[PDB]
């Protein structure tokens, strides 16, 4: 029930996938206005997870290896709506690397984003594939955020996630912010938020939050710093095993980005096959790191 092999873009190599993590990378320097100076880091990383977390580990429907996203219902899904913005940023680097699958692209674009951000290496693989319109999971996938820490366990499950997986994932660098125009909730998780951080976890541990409606008429947890949670950002710290875990990453930056380089790579890998003869996984170098 439902095999992706990875195969190799053609004659493809390192220094390939190198060059077009640098195109994006050097995209994210040079767009540096969008989103009132927050630039593309993070909802490069939203668009990466939400065509990754469409997956589901029964029947191994959705995913990122088919690079669906590209069609009008996924597209369209409400769940995705700010993500076009991610998608129009990817149009160049698509045109001058027309050789990279879709699925590929989607989800290079959100290790380049974390790695650019400063956050922790993520290994990446190649060999996912372009698959027909008709492969386009439904709308309905993605998890609310209306809900509470019940929710959120049963819902990772389907992802194949465990507990210290999700909030590792959650915590996601503390990145970008929430706009009322495309969810409902408006403003950000923290004050370095095109920084990769573990200040998620600080600040739902340090701040003085409260419980209040905004102008979408939804409930959000507000602190005075001027920062959001949602509810179901909160309900990592009304849940007893949850909550240890905020504490943990809290306390250990180094093991808040181990953790979360292997659970991103694991979702962005989730479905796929990779034959014994696959090349390793990818590291890529920042351009920092490149003297670019
Ligand atoms: C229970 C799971 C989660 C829920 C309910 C959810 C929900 C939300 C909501 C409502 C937004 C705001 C969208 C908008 O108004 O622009 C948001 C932002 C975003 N999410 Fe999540 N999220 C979850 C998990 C994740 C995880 C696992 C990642 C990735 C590792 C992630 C990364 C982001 C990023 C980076 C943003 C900011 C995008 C922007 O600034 O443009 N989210 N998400």
Redesign the pocket.
């Known amino acids: 029930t439902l095999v992706h092999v990875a195969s190799v873009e053609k004659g493809r190599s390192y220094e390939d996938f190198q060059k077009v993590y640098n195109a994006i990378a050097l995209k994210l320097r040079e767009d540096d206005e969008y ?1 009132n100076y ?1 630039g593309y880091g ?2 490069l ?2 668009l ?2 939400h065509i990754s ?1 469409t997956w589901d580990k029964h029947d191994n429907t959705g995913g990122s290896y088919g690079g669906t996203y590209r069609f009008k219902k996924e597209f369209n899904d409400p769940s995705n ?2 993500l076009q ?2 998608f129009k940023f990817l149009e160049p680097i698509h045109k001058e690397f027309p050789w990279i699958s879709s699925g590929d692209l989607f989800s290079l674009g959100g290790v380049t984003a974390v790695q650019e951000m400063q956050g922790p290496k993520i290994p990446w693989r190649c060999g996912r594939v372009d698959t027909p319109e008709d492969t386009t999971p439904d709308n309905g996938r ?4 209306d ?1 509470d820490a019940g929710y ?1 366990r049963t ?2 499950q389907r992802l194949n996630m465990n507990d210290r997986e ?1 909030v590792a ?2 915590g ?2 503390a ?12 403003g950000p998780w923290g004050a370095a ?1 095109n920084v990769f951080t573990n200040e998620f976890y600080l600040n739902l541990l340090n701040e003085d939050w409260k419980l209040e409606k905004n102008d979408a008429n939804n409930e959000q947890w507000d602190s005075k710093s001027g920062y959001m949670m ?1 509810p ?2 909160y309900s990592l710290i009304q849940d007893p095993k949850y909550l240890s875990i905020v504490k943990e990453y809290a306390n250990d930056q180094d093991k808040f980005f181990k953790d979360f380089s292997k659970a ?1 790579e694991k ?1 962005l890998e989730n479905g796929i096959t990779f034959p014994k003869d696959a090349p390793s996984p990818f590291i890529f170098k920042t351009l920092e790191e490149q003297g670019l």
């Open positions: 989103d927050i993070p909802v990383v939203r990466a997870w977390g709506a700010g913005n991610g993605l998890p609310d955020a809900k959120v819902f990772f999700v994932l959650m996601a660098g990145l970008g912010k929430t706009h009322l125009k495309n969810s409902g909730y408006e938020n949602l179901t950002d991103f979702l």
